[PDB]
Amino acid sequence: SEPQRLFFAIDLPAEIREQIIHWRAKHFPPEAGRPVAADNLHLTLAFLGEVSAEKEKALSLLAGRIRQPGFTLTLDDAGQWLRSRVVWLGMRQPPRGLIQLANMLRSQAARSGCFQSNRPFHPHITLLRDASEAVTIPPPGFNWSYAVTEFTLYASSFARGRTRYTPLKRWALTQ
Ligand SMILES: [Cl-]
């Protein structure tokens, strides 16, 4: 019944996660930044901040009322945001369904009193953190494309020199 640090996210198939870390190790030396663990690669829909058990339940219920078709993500884009010090993977033209889902979840969080960054939703998958220096970003690998069937509520913790994301609940997207 202690508060947890939560976020909604979309996950990647194992095969694609593996292609990504192989591609990453090939193009980015350790000095380019701190690599996100393969299992920790995800696309965040909405950050909720620290959330009480009571508030988690309310947000989970609102998430469960979402009615949306599934969509396809094709990762054709890669870049670097120096100020936020990340190297990221993303999509040039995200499907509307992704935008709809994120905005819906973000709206629900906001209306519940959740911490607001007032940052415009920029769908991305963080590959490197603490990326300070400016490196050369290659295009992604070929055919990193898959159907999104669901989204998940995660808890975030740190154990044994690792970041850990714990799945709490999942909701399927219709199709
Ligand atoms: Cl371009």
XYZ file of C-alpha atoms and ligand atoms in Angstrom:
176
model
C 0.000 0.000 0.000
C 3.073 2.215 -0.476
C 3.106 4.542 -3.519
C 4.729 3.377 -6.767
C 6.320 5.113 -9.752
C 4.151 4.238 -12.744
C 3.843 4.687 -16.492
C 1.827 3.332 -19.411
C 3.847 1.929 -22.310
C 3.961 -0.123 -25.493
C 6.358 -3.055 -25.691
C 8.439 -4.523 -28.492
C 8.548 -8.154 -29.652
C 11.622 -10.028 -28.381
C 13.047 -10.542 -31.868
C 12.932 -6.834 -32.664
C 14.393 -5.912 -29.264
C 17.287 -8.235 -30.112
C 17.779 -6.657 -33.547
C 17.838 -3.271 -31.830
C 20.547 -4.020 -29.271
C 22.693 -5.685 -31.949
C 22.297 -2.632 -34.167
C 23.001 -0.352 -31.199
C 26.210 -2.094 -30.119
C 27.454 -1.945 -33.696
C 26.926 1.791 -34.155
C 27.388 3.256 -30.646
C 30.499 2.811 -28.483
C 30.013 2.647 -24.685
C 31.137 6.284 -24.499
C 28.160 7.387 -26.585
C 25.890 6.768 -23.596
C 24.455 4.352 -21.039
C 22.651 1.543 -22.882
C 19.069 0.669 -21.976
C 18.768 -3.047 -21.221
C 17.062 -5.073 -23.959
C 14.146 -5.986 -21.694
C 13.733 -2.310 -20.778
C 13.195 -1.054 -24.328
C 9.706 0.422 -24.561
C 7.619 3.295 -25.919
C 6.119 5.368 -23.114
C 2.522 6.465 -23.642
C 2.099 8.374 -20.404
C 4.237 9.065 -17.333
C 2.203 9.092 -14.117
C 4.881 9.891 -11.553
C 4.484 8.639 -7.993
C 1.021 7.105 -7.631
C -0.815 5.825 -4.545
C -2.602 2.465 -4.529
C -5.938 4.291 -4.513
C -5.019 6.478 -7.485
C -3.549 3.527 -9.380
C -6.903 1.768 -9.116
C -8.800 4.796 -10.425
C -6.396 5.205 -13.340
C -6.528 1.496 -14.156
C -10.304 1.636 -14.413
C -10.190 4.639 -16.753
C -7.613 2.825 -18.883
C -9.959 -0.160 -19.027
C -12.692 1.974 -20.605
C -10.453 2.806 -23.584
C -11.859 1.380 -26.818
C -9.316 1.407 -29.630
C -8.235 -0.712 -32.581
C -4.684 -2.073 -32.684
C -2.115 -0.446 -34.958
C 1.238 -1.105 -36.620
C 4.510 0.474 -35.542
C 7.333 0.687 -38.068
C 10.543 2.099 -36.619
C 12.024 4.063 -39.531
C 13.571 6.884 -37.515
C 16.483 7.435 -35.147
C 17.862 10.571 -33.541
C 19.464 12.348 -30.611
C 18.092 14.907 -28.169
C 21.178 16.454 -26.537
C 19.368 18.550 -23.896
C 17.432 15.522 -22.616
C 20.648 13.557 -23.287
C 19.057 10.540 -24.970
C 19.525 8.677 -28.227
C 16.177 7.420 -29.457
C 14.371 5.219 -31.937
C 11.036 6.344 -33.362
C 8.578 6.807 -36.214
C 8.505 9.720 -38.669
C 4.726 9.526 -39.085
C 3.167 7.683 -36.119
C -0.234 6.115 -36.743
C -3.158 8.140 -35.392
C -4.113 5.226 -33.146
C -0.853 5.696 -31.248
C -1.508 9.411 -30.838
C -5.128 8.767 -29.832
C -4.128 6.239 -27.184
C -1.400 8.429 -25.706
C -3.562 11.554 -25.591
C -6.388 9.565 -23.997
C -4.114 8.144 -21.289
C -2.403 11.503 -20.762
C -5.774 13.236 -20.423
C -6.890 10.649 -17.876
C -3.703 11.083 -15.830
C -3.937 14.880 -15.904
C -7.569 14.914 -14.781
C -6.489 12.775 -11.808
C -3.829 15.196 -10.540
C -0.785 13.571 -12.139
C 2.437 15.540 -12.582
C 2.360 17.610 -15.780
C 5.535 18.320 -17.738
C 3.464 20.173 -20.318
C 5.624 18.519 -22.982
C 4.057 17.647 -26.389
C 3.807 13.863 -26.908
C 6.895 12.743 -28.851
C 6.613 8.946 -29.295
C 10.040 7.361 -28.998
C 12.065 4.437 -27.687
C 15.102 5.455 -25.651
C 18.223 3.534 -26.648
C 20.928 5.412 -24.765
C 20.736 7.562 -21.636
C 23.204 10.133 -20.353
C 24.177 10.739 -23.979
C 26.075 14.012 -23.600
C 28.364 14.138 -26.641
C 26.900 14.463 -30.133
C 27.368 11.305 -32.177
C 26.458 10.290 -35.720
C 23.058 8.599 -35.889
C 22.633 5.850 -38.491
C 19.205 4.988 -39.846
C 17.524 2.074 -38.053
C 17.820 -1.517 -39.222
C 15.517 -2.872 -41.910
C 11.928 -3.923 -41.288
C 11.566 -3.141 -37.581
C 7.794 -3.344 -37.939
C 5.098 -5.032 -35.854
C 1.455 -5.047 -34.789
C 0.634 -3.437 -31.433
C -2.003 -5.569 -29.692
C -2.032 -4.082 -26.187
C -0.605 -1.571 -23.720
C 0.711 -2.091 -20.208
C 0.917 -0.316 -16.862
C 4.445 -0.572 -15.439
C 6.048 0.050 -12.057
C 9.640 1.340 -12.049
C 12.319 0.283 -9.550
C 16.112 -0.022 -9.339
C 17.792 -3.214 -8.070
C 21.386 -4.492 -8.360
C 22.709 -1.775 -10.672
C 19.727 -2.238 -12.977
C 16.488 -0.442 -13.799
C 13.512 -2.754 -13.424
C 10.090 -2.406 -14.996
C 7.391 -4.569 -13.451
C 4.209 -5.210 -15.425
C 1.109 -4.558 -13.306
C -1.790 -4.684 -15.771
C -2.307 -5.067 -19.513
C -5.179 -4.010 -21.776
C -5.661 -5.385 -25.279
C -6.425 -3.087 -28.185
C -9.341 -4.313 -30.300
C -8.806 -5.705 -33.811
Cl 15.370 13.017 -42.795
